[PDB]
């Protein structure tokens, strides 16, 4: 009989809920009632990116704030020059089904993955004029959905097998395996200190993990639908989460509870990108209504609307220095937005 | 523009030129999706033409075909079924001998209904391949068909039994006006299956050929 273990599991869950309620005394909306509102924010597409022949599924910003890498279903990885719009590289891909792409912090490697269950690492600083695949990370039985670079040698990967893995480039083996997710994990984001990273799965939950020991500390709940996007706050003690349900939720690594939700009645679509700004005041959320609304992180107010896409927006990232914001949609176009 | 800046611009134009050439080749290739349920004769159909998903390429009458075997993903279907939007047709494989083995046919019907009423495939033609007909004739002579369908009223023959199964799969679509479903029976020694796929995609090519003409 295993019902005795279930009974004590429910008691532990009740204790967790009771602890969250005790620590909750004031809503983030109430404490920020004396802050001057931002007002209205207008962003214009300074540069549009042309050259993709299929829907764009992922895009990542380099650490130099100039180089952009975009992944599409056409099977081509393109390294874009944001300032000058020219294409630095065009890496052919063995598998045309790509769901995620990563840029190394040092800029010498580019990662890609998709339905082939393989995280291909491409060497972008070859002596030759071409870019080869340095490693083909294999071992995942589920579709790759998000991969991020800890450093030039360590790369984390979230796949459709409901398990996240830490990969070693030199040996091509899983150093640590993250288990505990019932549903397949879609999106992940690394903390600024690289020691932590959150994972969002279809089980309507987000989990905090440790790189060193490969164990889960906190499980975040509150979403009524599956999680599609999740990003870390600039500070590192918080993180926002996106879901198919038209709502954005902000959690803390210390309070271990939701503070304020970002939702509207006029919106009923899904969320694909939740990337934060540099200062963390602005929350940019990509949606399925061809729109990328601007959310005030401290007030859940509508400060601006980013429109101009003819299809669903699938990727959205903020550059390292926060100067400009790039948005990629299924219309095979990437738009870089800036203020005036 | 500087000396090296102009050189970078020229490289981008050459990169764009190569990208356009590859896209023209891709636009001339027919994409097909294989969505069989529970290994319902996936091997026999694939071998008749000419690790995660399997990419199968074959050419028939100067037309290149791309077939994807995505049934081995074993994950959330709705999280990657949108990547197959715009596909020319969907090839469905259902074994006729699985009705005698929470029935296996009901599992195929549930997955068929999921993709026939899917938003991403609201106009994609479906090619239903009812394979393993050789064993169906032998099985129908020793096992009644009423096990799978309690509402069946016909006899234990084969021609009427096959029509009833085909009819059941043809009433699972709520968009019959805008989407057509093709049904075929394939045996072990059959060799005309590739022609039927070619015939099915010709109609799809017809629909999208006059779409650029401003007719639909």
């Amino acid at each position, epitope marked *: 009989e295993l019902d005795q273990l279930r009974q004590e599991a429910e008691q532990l869950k009740n204790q967790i809920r009771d602890a969250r309620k005790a620590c909750a005394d004031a809503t983030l909306s109430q404490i920020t009632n004396n802050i001057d509102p931002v007002g209205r924010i207008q962003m214009r597409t300074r540069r549009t990116l042309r050259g993709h022949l299929a829907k764009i599924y992922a895009m990542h910003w380099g650490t130099d704030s100039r180089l952009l890498v975009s992944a599409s279903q056409d099977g081509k990885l393109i390294i874009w020059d944001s300032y000058t719009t020219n294409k*630095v590289h065009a890496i052919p891909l063995r598998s045309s089904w790509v769901m995620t792409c990563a840029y190394a912090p040092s800029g010498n490697y580019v990662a890609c993955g998709g339905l082939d269950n393989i995280c291909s690492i491409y060497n972008l600083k070859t002596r030759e004029g071409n870019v080869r695949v340095s490693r083909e990370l294999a071992g995942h039985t589920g579709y790759l959905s998000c991969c991020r670079f800890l450093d030039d040698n360590q790369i984390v990967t979230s796949s459709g097998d409901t398990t996240c893995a830490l990969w070693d480039i030199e040996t091509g083996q899983q150093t640590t395996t993250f288990t505990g997710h019932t549903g397949d994990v879609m999106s992940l984001s690394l903390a600024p200190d690289t020691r932590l990273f959150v994972s969002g799965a279809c089980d309507a939950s987000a989990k905090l993990w440790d790189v060193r020991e490969g164990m889960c500390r906190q499980t975040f709940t509150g979403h009524e639908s599956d999680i599609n996007a999740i990003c870390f706050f600039p500070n590192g003690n918080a993180f926002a989460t996106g879901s198919d349900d038209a709502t954005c939720r902000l959690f803390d690594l210390r309070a271990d509870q939701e503070l304020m939700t970002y939702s509207h009645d006029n919106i009923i679509c899904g969320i694909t990108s939740v990337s934060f700004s540099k200062s963390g005041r602005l929350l940019l959320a990509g949606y399925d209504d061809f729109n990328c609304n601007v959310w005030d992180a401290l007030k859940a107010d509508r400060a601006g609307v980013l429109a101009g896409h003819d299809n669903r927006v699938s990727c959205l990232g903020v550059t390292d220095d926060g100067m400009a914001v790039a948005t990629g949609s299924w219309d095979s176009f990437l738009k870089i937005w800036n203020g005036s | 523009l500087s000396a090296e*800046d102009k*050189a970078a611009v020229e490289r981008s134009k050459m990169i764009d030129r190569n990208l356009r050439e590859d896209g023209e080749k891709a636009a001339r290739e027919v994409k097909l999706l294989l969505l069989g349920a529970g290994e319902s004769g996936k091997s026999t159909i694939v071998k008749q033409m000419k690790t995660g998903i399997v990419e199968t390429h074959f050419t028939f009458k100067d037309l290149h075909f791309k077939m994807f075997d995505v049934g081995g993903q074993r994950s959330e279907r709705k999280k990657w079924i949108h990547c197959f939007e715009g596909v020319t047709a969907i090839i469905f494989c259902v074994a006729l001998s699985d009705y005698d083995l929470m029935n296996r046919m009901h599992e195929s019907m549930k997955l068929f209904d999921s993709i026939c009423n899917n938003k991403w495939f609201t106009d994609t033609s479906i090619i239903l391949f009812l394979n393993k007909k050789d064993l169906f004739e032998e099985k129908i002579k020793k096992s009644p068909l009423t096990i799978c369908y309690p509402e069946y009223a016909g006899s234990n023959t084969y021609e009427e039994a096959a029509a009833y199964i085909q009819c059941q799969f043809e009433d699972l679509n709520k968009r019959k006006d805008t989407k057509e479903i093709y049904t075929h029976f394939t045996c072990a020694t059959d060799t005309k299956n590739v022609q039927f796929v070619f015939d099915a995609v010709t109609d799809v090519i017809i629909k999208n050929n006059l779409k650029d003409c401003g007719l639909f």
Partner: single-chain antibody, 230 residues
Framework: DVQLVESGGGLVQPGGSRKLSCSAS????????MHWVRQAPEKGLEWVAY????????YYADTVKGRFTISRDDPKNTLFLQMTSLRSEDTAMYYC??????????????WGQGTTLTVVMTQATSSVPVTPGESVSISCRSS???????????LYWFLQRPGQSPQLLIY???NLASGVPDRFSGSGSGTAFTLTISRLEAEDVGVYYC?????????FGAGTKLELKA
């Protein structure tokens, strides 16, 4: 590894014609822009011709314009340079240099061995006495402001050890080339440039050649030899 072997040298009578075949092996010749640089005996370097990756864009030196014709064969990975009406000043060692848009610049990273042919941007004193273990600084000057509107200064530093092909050290006067020690460094302000070396070694003896990649018309420097003290 990366190799660039040239052939087609020897004794050429004045007014004749000859062709140089710089064979390419170990790298993608199709995506690499190629340059021709000649070095007169006991003299410096001077740019001759350049061909882009797609052969669409080709420039030429003023002294060799029209008389010299260049071509490339991407499938055969071989670079050609046919010459017409060779003069007395055309005798030099011709090097084929592969250039690619890399790190926001076009490094002259690899230089060929060269072949024997027989028929603005000033530098400091050609001879400077140096000793191992000491720091030596080499200065440079330009007739025009090499700084561009994009904030990039186009300066290239080259090392030509005796009995060896020139090797790139610093490109864009701020980024070290691949395979070079961290001792070398560069600085400047768009008109005056200096190169600083932390610690000298027995392999640092040679002639330092400066180069500008601003306009085309890349004018090399006279040279700076660092001989060992007695």
């Amino acid at each position: 590894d990366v190799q660039l072997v040239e052939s087609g040298g020897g004794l050429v009578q004045p007014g004749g014609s000859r062709k140089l075949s710089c064979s390419a092996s170990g790298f993608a010749f199709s995506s690499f822009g190629m340059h021709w640089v000649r070095q007169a005996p006991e003299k410096g370097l001077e740019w001759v011709a350049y061909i882009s990756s797609g052969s669409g864009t080709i420039y030429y030196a003023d002294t060799v314009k029209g008389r010299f014709t260049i071509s490339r064969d991407d499938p055969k990975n071989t670079l050609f340079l046919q010459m017409t009406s060779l003069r007395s000043e055309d005798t030099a060692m011709y090097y084929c240099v592969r250039s690619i848009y890399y790190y926001g610049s076009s490094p002259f990273d690899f230089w060929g061995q060269g072949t024997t042919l027989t028929v603005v941007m000033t530098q400091a004193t050609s001879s400077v006495p140096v000793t191992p273990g000491e720091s030596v600084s080499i200065s440079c000057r330009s007739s025009k402001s090499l700084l561009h509107s994009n904030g990039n200064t186009y300066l290239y530093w080259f090392l030509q050890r005796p009995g060896q092909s020139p090797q790139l050290l610093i490109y864009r006067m701020s980024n070290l080339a691949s395979g070079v020690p961290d001792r070398f460094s560069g600085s400047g302000s768009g008109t005056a440039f200096t190169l600083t070396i932390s610690r000298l070694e027995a392999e640092d003896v040679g002639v330092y050649y400066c180069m500008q990649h601003l306009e085309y018309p890349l004018t090399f420097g006279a040279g700076t030899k660092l001989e060992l003290k007695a």
